[PDB]
Design an enzyme around this catalytic site. Structure first.
Site, short mmCIF file in Angstrom:
data_model
loop_
_atom_site.label_atom_id
_atom_site.label_comp_id
_atom_site.label_asym_id
_atom_site.label_seq_id
_atom_site.Cartn_x
_atom_site.Cartn_y
_atom_site.Cartn_z
N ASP A 1 0.87 -1.08 -0.07
CA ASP A 1 0.07 0.11 -0.12
C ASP A 1 0.75 1.49 0.04
O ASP A 1 1.94 1.26 0.22
CB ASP A 1 -0.83 -0.05 1.09
CG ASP A 1 -2.11 0.89 1.12
OD1 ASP A 1 -2.21 1.77 -0.02
OD2 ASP A 1 -3.09 0.72 1.95
C1 8Q1 Z 1 -1.03 12.86 17.93
C2 8Q1 Z 1 -1.89 13.76 16.92
C3 8Q1 Z 1 -2.94 13.41 16.63
C4 8Q1 Z 1 -3.50 13.46 15.05
C5 8Q1 Z 1 -5.01 13.07 14.87
C6 8Q1 Z 1 -5.13 12.40 13.34
C7 8Q1 Z 1 -6.30 11.81 12.90
C8 8Q1 Z 1 -6.65 10.29 12.28
C9 8Q1 Z 1 -7.89 10.09 11.59
C10 8Q1 Z 1 -8.23 10.49 10.22
C11 8Q1 Z 1 -9.23 9.49 9.53
C12 8Q1 Z 1 -8.97 9.36 7.93
O1 8Q1 Z 1 -8.45 8.29 7.66
S1 8Q1 Z 1 -9.34 10.73 6.59
C13 8Q1 Z 1 -10.39 10.41 5.51
C14 8Q1 Z 1 -9.90 10.66 3.76
N1 8Q1 Z 1 -10.57 10.23 2.73
C15 8Q1 Z 1 -10.09 9.11 2.37
O2 8Q1 Z 1 -9.04 8.30 2.80
C16 8Q1 Z 1 -10.66 8.37 1.00
C17 8Q1 Z 1 -9.74 7.59 0.25
N2 8Q1 Z 1 -8.45 7.23 0.69
C18 8Q1 Z 1 -7.07 7.52 0.13
O3 8Q1 Z 1 -7.42 7.93 -1.28
C19 8Q1 Z 1 -5.92 7.04 0.73
O4 8Q1 Z 1 -4.85 7.63 -0.03
C20 8Q1 Z 1 -5.56 5.78 0.80
C21 8Q1 Z 1 -6.62 4.80 0.26
C22 8Q1 Z 1 -5.64 5.20 2.48
C23 8Q1 Z 1 -3.98 5.25 0.51
O5 8Q1 Z 1 -3.63 5.71 -0.71
P1 8Q1 Z 1 -2.58 5.03 -1.71
O6 8Q1 Z 1 -2.98 3.70 -2.03
O7 8Q1 Z 1 -2.53 5.93 -2.73
O8 8Q1 Z 1 -1.35 4.81 -0.71
#
Ligand code: 8Q1
Ligand code: CDL
Ligand code: PLX
Ligand code: PEE
Ligand code: PEE
Lengths: 128, 124, 88, 55, 175, 219, 459, 63, 70, 178, 104, 84
Positions: free
Chosen positions: C43
C-alpha cells in the site's frame, strides 16, 4: 469535538485549517495553474540569466528596485492631506514633545523650589 | 512555626509583634534583673575587627577561634573545640532570646487576663 | 564526528536490511530494483512507513514531496547518496 | 616585597600573552589550543598562591 | 619612602603580629615566599642597583615653578582689560589648586577606608569630617558657575551669598 | 525586591525545566534557577553565602555540561532526550560523572552542593522573610529534584532509542581528564573551602529537628 | 598658525604642476606631512589659549578638530582614488583642488579669533562641498540634495550675520577674547529672545537638529565617498564648535530658551535611532545614526556644564572617526555591488573575512563599547543630563539600547547569513581599502589611552 | 625541556617586570598600594614595637 | 589520543576495562567520602544542640506572678 | 526539495501528509518503542477504516476533521531531526559553503599549489562553455510557446548533450565542506 | 517569511524569496530574524490570558506574603555597647541614652 | 587514521520479537485482530547488551559496595589505632 483555535494578527491561521482550501473549483484550479505558470516563467528567466558562463555581474532584480523605490521615493508624491494623516502626524509629532516638556519642567521646578528652601541635602555634590 | 497560625488566624493582641519587642519593662517580672556580662573590651575587639553583625556577646569564643585559625593554618582541623564553644555560646544566646519571647508572651497573656477580669468585676 | 565515510555498498546494505526486517515482505522475493506498488503489492501507507523506517535509520528525514515519489530501493539509495554526497 | 600584589597581577598579565601571540606563527599551527590551555593551567596554579596567603 | 611627604598623607605605625606556629607542620607560605624571594626579588634588586648607579653617573635637576601674587578681580577697573586678564589667570590657577586639594583629601579618605578594613565606619570619622568640611568649602565657591565660568561670576556668587549672610545675621540680631 | 525577584525566577525556571526535551535547555534552566536562588540568598542579607554558592555551582554545573556535551557528541549531534536510551552501561564514565553532578546539584549531605544549598535553605527558613518567597524556594527545590531525576531517567535508564549505527566512544584522554578534574572538585571543594575560609556570619546553631530536615525531605 | 596654513596653500600648485600619474602619491604624502605638522597644536595649557596673533588662536577645543581635519584629507584622497580612475587629469586635479580648499577653509574656520571671519569661512566651506556633491555624484537627485544642503544652511545662517553685526554695533567688538572678558547678562526681552534665536539657529541647522535634519540624508546618500566623509566627520562639528563659542554671550537667557531644543533633541535621538531599524540603505542608516549622535551633542551643549562640554568634544571626535569609517566600508561594498542596498549582498564575512573584522570593529565603536572615547563622551553627557534632571536617563537608556540594536543589525544583514548566489564579481579586498580602515580605526584606540587630549578646554 | 623554557618566558619574565614596576614605580607614589592592617588578637606581639597585647578577662570555661 | 574502536551497528559497543574501572573507582570513592563524613561529622545533618520546649519552662525563671501581685 | 512542486495537492497527497505528521507527532508523544508501535498500529488501523470510501464530499469531511484533531494534540514540542528546518543543526555549516567561482580570484602563488585540481577545473570550464551554448538552443526549442507552465527541466536527448541548466546543480559546494 | 515552505528551492534560501516575485512592503520586518506570524498550538488569546493570569497571581501573592511575613519565636538580637553606638556612626561627644540588656 | 575496517552487517534472521515487550504488544494487538509490520525492526534494542536494565536506586548506588567495604576497613583501622 475539540476546542477551537482562534487566529490572530501575530499567530495566523494554520495552512491545513483554512476553510478555503477544501472548497475546490475549476476556477480555483485554473488560478493555481496560472500562478505556478508565472512563478515558473520567472524561475526560468532567473536560471537562464544565472547559469550563463559569460555573465560576470549581479543580476538586477526589478522587484527589489520597485520595493526600495516605493518605500523611499514614492511616498510624498502619493501623499494627500487627510484627517487621518493630519491627526496622526500632529499626535505623533507634537504630543511626545509637549509631554516630555511638561515632565521635565515640573521636575526642574520642584528641584528649584527645594534648593530655594534648601531642604535638598546637596552635600558632596561637586561635579555637574 | 506554630505561632504564625495562632497569630494570623487567631487573636492579633494575643501574641506580640517581633518588631516592637519588648513592650514591658525588664524588671517587671522580678526585681533582681541581673545585667549581662562582657569579656571583650572596645580596643581588642576592634583590633580583631570581626564584623558589625558579629559583634555580639559571643565575641570571646570567636576571637579564640580566629586565633586558632591563624596559628594552626595548614592543619585547618586543629582547633575544633573553640568552634564547638562558639556554637554553644550562640546557642545560649538564641535560647535566651527564645526565653525572652516566651516571657513577654506570658506577660501579655496574664495582662490580658487581668483587664478581662477587671471588666468582669466592673460589669458585676 | 569520528564518522566512517559510508559508501554506496553500505547504504544499499542497510536499505535491504531494513526492508528484510519489514515482515510484510518476504525477504527472498524482494530485490534492489523491485517495485513497491506492483512487485511487492504494498500500500501507499506501507510505502510511507518504509519512508519512516529510512528516516529513522539514516538519521535524517526526507521531504514529503520527494518521499511520495520514491518507489524503488535503488532510486531511494540514489537519492540518499545525492543528499549525502557519496563518492563510490 | 609582599608577593601578594605581584602574583595577583602576574596571573592576569600572563593570561593575556596568547592574545599577543595571536599574530605570531603559532596561531597558524595546530598547537595553539594546547598553548592556550597550558597558559590557563599555569595561571591557575600561580593564582593558587594568593589564595593560600589569604587563607 | 622619601619620594613623598609623610605629613601630607599620614599613615598609622602599622603594627603587625608575630608568627606563632602552634603545630610542628611546616607551612607552605614561608617556603613559598622564600623561594619567591630567591627567584624574583634578588634579580629585580640587582637590576635596580645597576639602574641606580647608571642614573648617578648622570645627574640633573628640575625646579618647581613659582608664581607671584597679582591683584585679583576686586582690584580691577570695570573695563581695564589687562588687570582682568591677570586676575582671571590667577583665579584659574587657584581653582586648579583647590581641585588638587580636594583630590588629596579624597585620597586620604579612600586610603583610610581600605586600610582600617572592617571598622572603617568608626576609625575613619576624622577623614570623613575633613572631607565634609573641604567639600562644603569647595562647593560654595564654584558649584553653580557652570561652563564659561569666570572670576567675575565667582565674585558675584560670593557677594550674593555674603549679602544673604549679612541679612540673616542682622535679622537674627534684631529678632 | 531582590528576594521576590529571585524566588519568582527560580520557581518559573524550574517549572519550565521539569518539562523540556532538550538536555541543554533543561540544564540552562537549572542554571537560571540556581541564579534565582543566589539572589534569594542576597535578599536575606547573606552575600558571602551567595558567593560560596557561586563557587560550588561553577564546579558542578560546568561538569554537568561536560557530561551533556559528551552525550551529544557521542550520539552524532543529537540533543533531544527522546532519542537517547540506555547509557548506564553503554557509556559508564559519563554516567557516573552525571550521577555525581546531579547528586551535588540536589544537595546530598557532605557533597559540594550541601555546604552551600543547605545553608541557603537554613538561612531562608531562619530569617524574617516573606512566606511566599520561602514557599516558592521550597517548591523550586522540589522541581530541581524533579528535573534532575527526569534527566537521569530519560537519558540513562530506558532501552536505547538512537539510530542503529552505534558510534558511542569515550576512550579519549582529554575528555576523561577534563571531566575527572571537575569530578574531584565537585566532590571535595565544598568541604575544603568551607573548612578553610574564615567564619563570616552568625550560624543557625539551633533549629527544630523537622525544620533542619526540610531540605532533605523536600529533595 | 601659518606653519600649517602655508603648506595647505602650497598643496594647490604642487597638485596642478604634478605629473599626470603622480597626483595621488604627491597629495597623500604631503597631506600626511601636514597632518604631522598639525600635531604640535595639541600641547595646550590650562591657561587662556594659544594666541598666535591677532587673527588666529588655538584652543584645546580647536586643536583636536584641527588635527582631525588635517588627518581626514589623506583618507579622502585614498577613498577617492578608486572611482576616479576613468577620469581625465584636469578633473581629478579639480577634485583634489576642491578637497584642499575645503581643508583650508576648515583650518581657518577653527582658529578664527573674530566672529565675522568665522562666519565668512564657515559659509565659505559651503561652496566646495556643494560642487563636489553636485558634480561628481552618481544619481540624478544630487542636484536636489545640493539645493537642500545650500538653502537649509543659508536660511539658518542669514539671520546670524545680522545678529553678529548688531552685536558688534552695540558691544563694539566681535573678538572672542574681548567678548569673553566683557560678557554681560542678557535681559529676558523679546528683542533678546530673537537675538538668541538668530545666534543659535544657524549652528542648530548644521548639527542638525531633529526638526531641521532633512537635508542630511539627501546630501550623504548623493555625495561621493569623500563628500560623505567630510560631511560626517568635520562639517557637522562646525555647528557644535559655533555653539560652544557663541553660548557665552547668551546666558542667562539660555535656560528658558533651551527647552524647545532640549525636548526636540531628546525625542529626535529616539526617533532617528528607531528609523535606523527600518532602513533599506546603508548610507541612510549611517546618516540617521549621525543625526542621533549629533542630537545628543546638542543636548550636551544646551545643558552647558563642564562635564557636558567635555563629553560633547569627545563624542564629536569619536563620531567623526566612526562615521567616516562606516561610510568607507559602505563605499567598499558599493564599488563591488553597485546597488548600495543592504539586503542584496549578504554573507560577506565568508568571502571577505578581514573586511568583516573591520565591519565588526566599526560597529562596536559606533555602539559605544568601553573604554572607547565614544562611550567616554556618551557617559559624560549622560551624567551631566542626569544631574540636570533624573528623568532624562530613561530616554538616554532607550537610545543606548536602540543604538546597539541597529548597529548589530547592520553587522548581521550584510556580513552574516548566506551569500547571495548570483553575485560573482566580489573580488578580494585591496591593500588600499584595508589600509584605509586601519588608518581610520587606529587613532580611536590610541586616543582612548589619552582621553584628556580630546576633552576640551574645561578639562 | 618544553616546560622549562615556557615557565621562564611566560611566568618568570612577566613577574620580573611587574614586581619591578610595583616595588619601584607604583609604591613610589602614596596610597597606590593599600593593605588591610591585619588582625591583632590578644596575646600577640608586634615585631616593630615588641609589646604584647594583654590577655582577656578569664571567662568561666565549661563545656 | 585514544585507541581504535570501530562502530557496531545495533550491538552493544565495545567497552574498555579502563573506563569502567575508573568510573567504578570514582563512584566508590564518592560513596566512601560520604560515609566517612557521616561517621566523623554526623551533627552537620542531625544537629548537636537540642531545641528547647517553650511550654516546659516553669513560671519562676520567666518572671511570672500568680495573676494578682501585678 | 529537488523535485519541482505541483500546482496543487490531491486528496491522497493530503491524507498521506497528514498520516506522516500524525505518526511523527505520536512518536514524539510515545518516547518508548513498544508504546509507539502499539499506538501507531492502532492509529494505522483507525486510518484504514475509511479507505474504500467513495463519496468525495464525505472524503472532504474526512481528514480535514482529523486535521483539527491533529492540531489539538500536536505535541507543542515535537521531535525534529538535527539537520531539519527546525533542528538544532539546521544551518550549522552554511558558513563553510564557499562558492566555486571564488577560485578564479586566487593569487597565482596559491594556484601553484594544487595544479591538477585547477587543470581539471579548466576542463570543467571548457565543458560548461560548450554545453551552455548547446543548452540555450535546446531549451529554446523544447520550451512550450507562451512560457513554461511547470518549473521542471527536460533532460538531454542527444549524445553529446548535457542536462540543461546543470552547472549550479552539479557544482554544489558540499554538505559538510569543512 | 519564517512560515514559508523551508523545503522549496528558493533563489534566496536564507530569506526564502524568489527572484522575480513581488516583495512585501514590510519584508524587512519579517526576515526570520524578527517578528514572525507562524501559528502556535495554543491560541493567542489563551496564551495572553494564561500568561497575564500567572503574572498577576504572582504579584498578588508576593504582596500578601509581604503583609504576612514569617519569623521565629525569638526576640530582637541584643548588642553589648549601647547597641554598638560607638562603632556604628560614631559621635562619641554626645553620650546617648544607655541601654542595659535583660538577663534571663 | 580513520575507521576503515569493512564492517559487515549481522544476519536479519537473528532479530526475533520473542522475549521482548514487543511480544506483549503483539498479544495485545492480536487480541483486537491487528499485527505490527515493524516488530522485528526494533528487536535489536532488546537483544544484546541492552537486554539487562538497572533501576533508579541501583543507578544511584553505582559504587556503594566498594565504598562501604573501604569505609568499614578504614573505620576498623582507625578504631584499632586510636585505642592505643
Ligand atoms: C498525535 C496527533 C493526533 C493526530 C490526529 C489524526 C487523525 C487520524 C484519523 C483520520 C481519518 C482518515 O483516515 S481521513 C479520510 C480521507 N478520505 C479517504 O481516505 C478516502 C480515500 N483514501 C485514499 O485515497 C488514501 O490515499 C488511501 C486509500 C488510504 C491510501 O492511498 P495509496 O493507495 O495512494 O497509498
Ligand atoms: C585584551 C588584552 C590584549 C593585550 C594584547 C594587545 C592586543 C592589541 C590588539 C589591538 C586591537 C587590534 C587592532 C584593531 C583591529 C584588528 C586588527 C587586525 O587586523 O587583526 C588581525 C589579526 C589576525 O587576523 P586574521 O586571523 O588574519 O583574520 C581573521 C578574521 O579577520 C577574523 O578576525 P577575528 O574574528 O579573530 O577578529 C579579531 C579579534 C580582535 O580584533 C578586534 O576586534 C580589535 C578591536 C577590539 C576592540 C573593539 C573596540 C572596543 C573598544 C576597546 C578600546 C580599547 C583601547 C585600549 C587601547 C588600545 C590601543 C591600540 O576579535 C575579537 O577578539 C573581538 C574582541 C572584543 C573585545 C571586547 C572587550 C573590549 C574591552 C577589553 C578591555 C580592554 C582594556 C582593558 C583595560 C583594563 C585591563 C588592562 O587578529 C588580531 O590581531 C586579533 C587581536 C586580538 C584581539 C584583541 C581584542 C582586545 C583588544 C582591545 C584593545 C587593546 C587593549 C590593550 C590593553 C589590554 C589589557
Ligand atoms: C520645525 C522644526 C523645529 C524648528 C525649531 C523650533 C524651536 C524654536 C521655537 C521657539 C521657542 C519659544 C519662542 C518664545 C518663548 C518665550 C516664552 C513663552 O513661550 O512663554 C510665555 C509667553 O507667552 C506666550 O507664549 C506669548 C507668545 C505667543 C506667540 C508665539 C507663537 C506660539 C506658537 C508658534 C510656534 C511657531 C514657531 C516656528 C515659526 C516659523 C511666558 O509668558 P510672558 O511672561 O508673558 O513672556 C515672557 C517673555 N518676556 C519676558 C520676554 C516678556
Ligand atoms: C526656525 C527658527 C526659529 C524661528 C522662530 C521665530 C520665527 C518667526 C520670525 C520670522 C522673522 C521675523 C522678522 C522680524 C523679527 C524682529 C526681531 C527684532 O527686530 O529684534 C531685533 C533685536 C532688537 O531690535 P532693536 O530695535 O535694535 O532694539 C532696540 C529696542 N530694544 O536686535 C537683534 O537681536 C537683531 C538680531 C536679528 C534677529 C533675527 C531675525 C530673524 C529671526 C531669528 C532667527 C530664527 C529663524 C531661523 C531660521 C531657521 C532656518 C534654519
Ligand atoms: C522596554 C524595551 C522594549 C523592547 C524593544 C523592542 C525592540 C524591537 C526591535 C527588535 C528586533 C526584532 C527581534 O529582535 O526579534 C525578536 C527576537 C526573535 O525571537 P525568538 O524568540 O528568538 O525566535 C527565534 C525562533 N524562531 O527575540 C527578541 O530578542 C525579542 C526581545 C524583546 C524583549 C522586549 C520585552 C522586554 C520586557 C522586559 C520587562 C521586565 C524588566 C525587568 C525588571 C527588573 C526589575 C528589577
Amino acid at each position: 469535538s475539540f476546542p477551537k483555535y482562534k487566529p490572530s494578527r501575530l499567530a495566523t491561521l494554520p495552512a491545513t485549517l483554512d476553510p478555503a482550501e477544501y472548497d475546490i473549483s475549476p476556477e480555483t484550479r485554473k488560478a493555481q495553474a496560472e500562478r505556478l505558470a508565472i512563478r515558473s516563467r520567472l524561475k526560468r528567466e532567473y536560471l537562464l540569466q544565472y547559469n550563463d558562463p559569460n555573465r560576470l555581474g549581479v543580476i538586477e532584480d526589478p522587484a527589489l528596485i520597485r520595493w526600495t523605490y516605493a518605500r523611499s521615493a514614492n511616498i510624498y508624491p502619493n501623499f494627500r492631506p487627510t484627517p487621518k494623516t493630519s491627526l496622526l502626524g500632529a499626535l505623533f509629532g507634537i504630543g511626545p514633545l509637549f509631554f516630555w516638556y511638561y515632565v521635565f519642567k515640573t521636575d526642574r521646578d520642584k528641584k528649584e523650589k527645594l534648593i530655594q528652601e534648601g531642604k535638598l541635602d546637596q552635600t558632596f555634590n561637586i561635579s555637574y | 512555626g506554630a505561632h504564625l497560625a495562632r497569630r494570623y488566624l487567631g487573636d492579633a493582641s494575643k501574641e506580640p509583634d517581633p518588631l516592637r519587642m519588648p513592650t514591658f519593662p525588664p524588671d517587671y517580672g522580678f526585681p533582681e534583673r541581673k545585667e549581662r556580662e562582657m569579656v571583650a573590651t572596645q580596643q581588642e575587639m576592634n583590633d580583631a575587627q570581626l564584623m558589625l553583625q558579629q559583634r555580639d556577646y559571643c565575641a570571646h569564643y570567636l576571637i579564640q577561634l580566629l586565633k586558632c585559625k591563624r596559628d594552626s593554618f595548614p592543619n585547618f582541623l586543629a582547633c575544633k573545640h573553640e568552634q564547638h564553644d562558639w556554637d554553644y555560646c550562640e546557642h545560649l544566646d538564641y535560647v535566651k532570646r527564645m526565653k525572652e519571647f516566651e516571657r513577654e508572651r506570658r506577660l501579655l497573656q496574664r495582662k490580658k487576663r487581668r483587664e478581662q477580669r477587671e471588666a468582669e468585676m466592673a460589669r458585676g | 564526528s569520528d564518522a566512517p565515510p559510508l559508501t554506496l555498498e553500505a547504504i544499499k546494505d542497510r536499505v535491504l536490511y531494513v526492508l528484510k526486517l519489514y515482515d510484510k515482505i518476504d525477504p527472498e522475493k524482494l530485490s534492489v530494483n523491485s517495485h513497491f506498488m506492483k512487485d511487492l503489492g504494498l500500500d501507499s501507507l506501507d510505502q510511507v512507513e518504509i519512508i519512516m523506517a529510512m528516516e529513522d535509520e539514516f538519521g535524517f528525514e526526507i521531504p514529503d514531496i520527494d518521499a511520495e515519489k520514491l518507489m524503488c530501493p535503488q532510486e531511494i539509495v540514489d537519492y540518499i547518496a545525492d543528499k549525502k554526497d557519496v563518492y563510490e | 616585597m609582599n608577593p601578594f600584589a605581584s602574583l595577583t597581577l602576574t596571573t592576569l598579565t600572563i593570561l593575556t600573552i596568547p592574545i599577543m601571540m595571536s599574530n605570531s606563527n603559532i596561531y597558524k599551527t595546530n598547537l595553539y589550543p594546547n598553548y592556550v590551555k597550558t597558559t590557563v593551567s599555569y595561571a591557575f596554579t600561580l593564582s593558587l598562591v594568593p589564595l593560600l596567603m589569604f587563607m | 619612602p622619601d619620594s613623598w611627604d609623610k605629613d601630607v598623607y599620614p599613615e598609622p605605625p602599622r603594627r603587625t603580629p608575630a608568627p606563632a606556629p602552634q603545630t610542628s607542620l611546616p607551612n607552605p607560605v614561608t617556603y613559598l615566599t622564600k623561594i619567591f624571594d630567591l627567584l624574583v626579588d634578588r634579580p629585580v634588586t640587582l637590576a635596580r642597583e645597576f639602574i641606580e648607579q647608571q642614573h648617578a653617573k648622570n645627574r640633573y635637576y628640575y625646579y618647581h615653578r613659582e608664581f607671584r601674587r597679582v591683584p585679583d578681580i576686586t582690584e580691577c577697573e570695570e573695563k581695564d582689560i589687562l588687570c582682568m586678564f591677570e586676575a582671571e589667570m590667577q583665579w584659574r590657577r587657584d581653582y586648579k589648586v583647590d581641585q588638587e586639594i580636594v583630590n588629596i583629601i579624597q585620597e586620604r579618605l579612600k586610603a583610610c577606608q581600605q586600610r582600617e578594613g572592617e571598622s572603617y565606619r568608626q576609625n575613619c570619622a576624622k577623614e570623613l569630617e575633613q572631607f565634609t568640611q573641604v567639600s562644603k568649602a569647595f562647593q560654595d565657591r564654584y558649584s553653580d558657575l557652570g561652563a564659561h565660568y569666570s572670576a567675575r561670576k565667582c565674585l558675584a556668587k560670593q557677594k550674593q551669598r555674603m549679602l544673604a549672610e549679612r541679612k540673616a545675621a542682622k535679622e537674627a540680631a534684631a529678632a | 525586591m531582590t528576594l521576590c525577584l529571585g524566588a519568582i525566577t527560580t520557581l518559573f525556571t524550574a517549572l519550565c525545566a521539569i518539562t523540556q526535551n532538550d538536555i541543554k535547555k533543561i540544564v540552562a534552566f537549572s542554571t537560571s534557577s540556581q541564579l534565582g536562588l543566589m539572589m534569594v540568598t542576597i535578599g536575606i542579607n547573606q552575600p558571602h553565602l551567595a558567593f560560596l554558592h557561586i563557587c560550588m555551582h561553577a564546579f558542578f554545573k560546568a561538569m554537568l555540561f561536560m557530561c551533556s556535551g559528551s552525550i551529544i557528541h557521542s550520539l552524532n549531534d543529537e540533543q533531544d532526550i527522546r532519542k537517547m536510551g540506555g547509557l548506564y552501561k553503554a557509556m559508564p564514565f559519563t554516567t557516573t560523572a552525571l550521577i555525581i553532578g546531579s547528586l551535588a546539584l540536589t544537595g546530598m549531605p557532605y557533597l559540594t552542593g550541601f555546604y552551600s544549598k543547605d545553608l541557603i535553605i537554613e538561612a531562608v527558613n531562619m530569617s524574617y522573610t516573606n512566606a511566599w518567597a520561602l514557599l516558592m524556594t521550597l517548591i523550586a527545590t522540589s522541581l530541581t529534584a524533579a528535573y534532575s531525576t527526569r534527566i537521569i531517567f530519560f537519558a540513562f535508564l530506558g532501552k536505547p532509542r538512537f539510530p542503529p549505527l552505534v558510534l558511542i566512544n569515550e576512550n579519549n584522554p582529554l575528555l576523561i581528564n577534563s571531566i575527572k578534574r571537575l569530578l574531584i572538585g565537585s566532590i571535595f571543594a565544598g568541604f575544603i573551602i568551607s573548612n578553610n575560609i574564615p567564619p563570616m556570619t552568625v550560624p543557625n546553631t539551633t533549629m527544630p529537628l523537622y525544620m533542619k530536615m526540610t531540605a532533605l525531605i523536600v529533595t | 598658525m601659518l606653519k600649517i596654513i602655508i603648506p595647505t596653500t602650497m598643496l594647490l600648485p604642487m597638485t596642478w604642476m604634478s605629473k599626470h600619474n603622480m597626483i595621488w602619491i604627491n597629495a597623500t604624502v604631503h597631506s600626511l606631512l601636514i597632518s604631522l605638522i598639525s600635531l604640535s597644536l595639541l600641547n595646550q595649557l590650562g591657561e587662556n589659549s594659544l594666541n598666535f596673533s591677532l587673527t588666529f588662536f588655538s584652543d584645546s577645543l580647536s586643536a583636536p578638530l584641527l588635527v582631525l581635519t588635517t588627518w581626514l584629507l589623506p583618507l579622502m584622497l585614498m577613498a577617492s582614488q578608486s572611482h576616479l580612475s576613468k577620469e581625465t587629469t584636469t578633473r581629478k586635479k579639480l577634485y583634489i583642488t576642491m578637497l584642499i580648499l575645503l581643508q583650508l577653509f576648515l583650518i581657518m574656520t577653527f582658529t578664527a579669533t573674530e566672529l565675522i571671519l568665522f562666519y565668512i569661512l564657515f559659509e565659505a566651506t559651503l561652496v566646495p562641498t556643494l560642487i563636489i556633491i553636485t558634480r561628481w555624484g552618481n544619481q540624478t537627485e544630487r542636484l536636489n540634495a545640493g539645493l537642500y544642503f545650500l538653502f537649509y544652511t543659508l536660511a539658518g545662517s542669514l539671520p546670524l550675520l545680522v545678529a553678529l553685526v548688531y552685536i558688534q554695533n552695540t558691544t563694539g567688538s566681535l573678538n572672542f577674547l574681548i567678548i569673553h572678558y566683557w560678557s554681560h547678562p542678557l535681559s529676558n526681552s523679546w528683542s533678546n529672545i530673537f537675538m538668541w534665536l538668530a545666534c543659535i539657529m544657524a549652528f542648530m541647522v548644521k548639527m542638525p537638529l531633529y526638526g531641521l535634519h532633512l537635508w542630511l540624508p539627501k546630501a550623504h546618500v548623493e555625495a561621493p565617498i569623500a563628500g560623505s566623509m567630510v560631511l560626517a566627520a568635520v562639517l557637522l562639528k562646525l555647528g557644535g564648535y559655533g555653539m560652544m563659542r557663541i553660548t557665552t554671550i547668551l546666558n542667562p537667557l539660555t535656560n528658558y530658551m533651551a527647552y524647545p531644543f532640549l525636548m526636540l533633541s531628546m525625542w529626535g535621538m529616539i526617533m532617528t535611532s528607531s528609523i535606523c531599524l527600518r532602513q533599506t540603505d546603508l548610507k541612510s542608516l549611517i546618516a540617521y545614526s549621525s543625526v542621533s549622535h549629533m542630537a545628543l551633542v546638542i543636548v550636551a551643549i544646551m545643558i552647558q556644564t563642564p562635564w557636558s562640554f567635555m563629553g560633547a568634544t569627545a563624542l564629536m571626535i569619536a563620531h567623526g572617526l566612526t562615521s567616516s569609517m562606516l561610510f568607507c566600508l559602505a563605499n567598499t561594498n558599493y564599488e563591488r555591488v553597485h546597488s548600495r542596498t543592504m539586503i542584496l549582498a549578504r554573507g560577506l564575512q565568508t568571502l571577505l573575512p578581514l573586511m568583516a573584522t573591520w565591519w565588526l570593529v566599526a560597529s562596536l565603536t559606533n555602539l559605544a563599547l568601553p573604554p572607547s572615547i565614544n562611550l567616554i563622551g556618551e557617559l559624560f553627557i549622560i551624567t551631566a543630563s542626569f544631574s540636570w534632571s533624573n528623568i532624562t536617563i530613561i530616554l538616554m537608556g532607550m537610545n543606548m539600547m536602540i543604538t546597539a540594536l541597529y548597529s548589530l543589525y547592520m553587522l548581521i544583514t550584510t556580513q552574516r547569513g548566506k551569500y547571495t548566489h548570483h553575485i560573482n564579481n566580489i573580488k578580494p579586498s585591496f591593500t588600499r581599502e584595508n589600509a584605509l580602515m586601519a588608518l581610520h580605526i587606529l587613532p580611536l584606540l590610541l586616543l582612548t589611552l589619552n582621553p584628556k587630549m580630546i576633552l576640551g578646554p574645561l578639562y | 625541556y618544553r616546560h622549562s623554557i615556557f615557565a621562564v618566558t611566560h611566568v618568570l619574565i612577566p613577574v620580573w617586570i611587574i614586581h619591578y614596576y610595583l616595588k619601584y614605580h607604583v609604591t613610589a607614589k602614596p596610597y597606590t598600594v593599600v593593605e588591610r592592617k591585619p588582625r591583632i588578637f590578644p596575646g600577640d606581639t608586634i615585631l616593630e614595637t615588641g609589646e604584647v597585647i594583654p590577655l582577656m578577662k578569664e571567662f568561666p570555661d565549661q563545656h | 589520543g585514544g585507541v581504535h574502536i570501530e562502530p557496531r551497528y545495533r550491538q552493544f559497543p565495545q567497552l574498555t576495562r579502563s573506563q569502567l574501572i575508573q568510573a567504578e573507582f570514582f563512584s566508590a570513592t564518592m560513596w566512601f567520602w560520604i560515609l566517612w563524613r557521616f561517621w566523623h561529622d554526623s551533627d552537620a545533618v542531625l544537629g548537636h544542640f537540642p531545641y528547647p520546649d517553650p511550654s516546659q519552662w516553669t513560671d519562676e525563671e520567666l518572671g511570672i506572678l500568680p495573676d494578682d501581685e501585678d | 526539495a529537488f523535485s519541482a512542486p505541483a500546482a496543487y495537492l490531491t486528496h491522497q497527497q493530503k491524507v498521506l501528509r497528514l498520516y506522516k505528521r500524525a505518526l511523527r507527532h505520536l512518536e514524539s508523544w510515545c518516547v518508548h518503542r513498544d508504546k509507539y508501535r502499539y499506538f501507531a498500529c492502532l492509529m494505522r488501523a483507525r486510518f484504514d477504516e475509511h479507505k474504500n470510501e467513495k463519496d468525495m464530499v464525505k472524503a472532504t469531511q474526512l481528514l480535514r476533521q482529523a486535521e483539527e484533531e491533529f492540531w489539538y494534540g500536536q505535541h507543542p514540542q515535537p521531535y525534529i531531526f538535527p539537520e531539519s528546518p527546525g533542528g538544532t543543526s539546521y544551518e550549522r555549516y552554511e558558513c563553510y559553503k564557499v562558492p566555486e567561482w571564488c577560485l578564479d580570484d586566487w593569487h597565482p602563488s596559491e594556484k601553484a599549489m594544487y595544479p591538477d585540481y585547477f587543470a581539471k577545473r579548466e576542463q570543467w570550464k571548457r565543458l560548461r562553455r560548450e554545453s551552455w551554448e548547446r543548452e540555450v538552443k535546446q531549451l529554446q526549442e523544447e520550451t512550450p510557446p507562451g512560457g513554461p507552465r511547470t518549473e521542471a527541466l527536460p533532460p538531454a536527448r542527444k549524445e553529446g548533450d548535457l542536462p540543461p541548466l546543470w552547472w549550479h546543480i552539479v557544482t554544489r559546494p558540499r554538505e559538510r565542506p569543512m | 517569511q519564517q512560515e514559508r515552505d523551508p523545503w522549496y528551492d528558493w533563489d534566496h534560501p536564507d530569506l526564502r524569496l524568489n527572484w522575480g516575485e513581488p516583495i512585501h512592503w514590510d519584508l524587512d520586518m519579517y526576515i526570520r530574524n524578527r517578528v514572525d506570524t507562524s501559528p502556535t498550538p495554543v491560541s493567542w488569546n489563551t496564551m495572553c490570558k494564561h500568561l497575564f493570569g500567572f503574572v498577576a497571581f504572582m504579584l498578588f501573592m508576593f504582596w500578601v506574603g509581604e503583609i504576612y511575613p514569617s519569623y521565629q519565636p525569638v526576640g530582637p538580637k541584643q548588642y553589648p555597647y549601647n547597641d554598638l553606638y560607638l562603632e556604628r556612626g560614631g559621635d562619641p561627644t554626645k553620650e546617648p541614652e544607655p541601654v542595659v540588656h535583660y538577663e534571663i | 587514521e580513520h575507521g576503515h575496517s569493512k564492517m559487515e552487517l549481522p544476519d536479519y534472521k537473528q532479530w526475533k520479537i520473542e522475549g521482548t515487550p514487543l511480544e506483549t504488544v503483539q498479544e495485545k494487538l492480536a487480541a483486537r485482530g491487528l499485527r505490527d509490520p515493524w516488530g522485528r525492526n526494533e528487536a535489536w534494542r532488546y537483544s544484546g547488551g541492552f537486554a539487562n536494565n538497572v533501576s533508579f536506586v541501583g543507578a544511584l548506588l553505582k559504587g556503594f559496595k566498594w565504598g562501604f567495604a573501604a569505609f568499614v576497613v578504614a573505620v576498623g583501622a582507625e578504631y584499632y589505632l586510636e585505642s592505643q
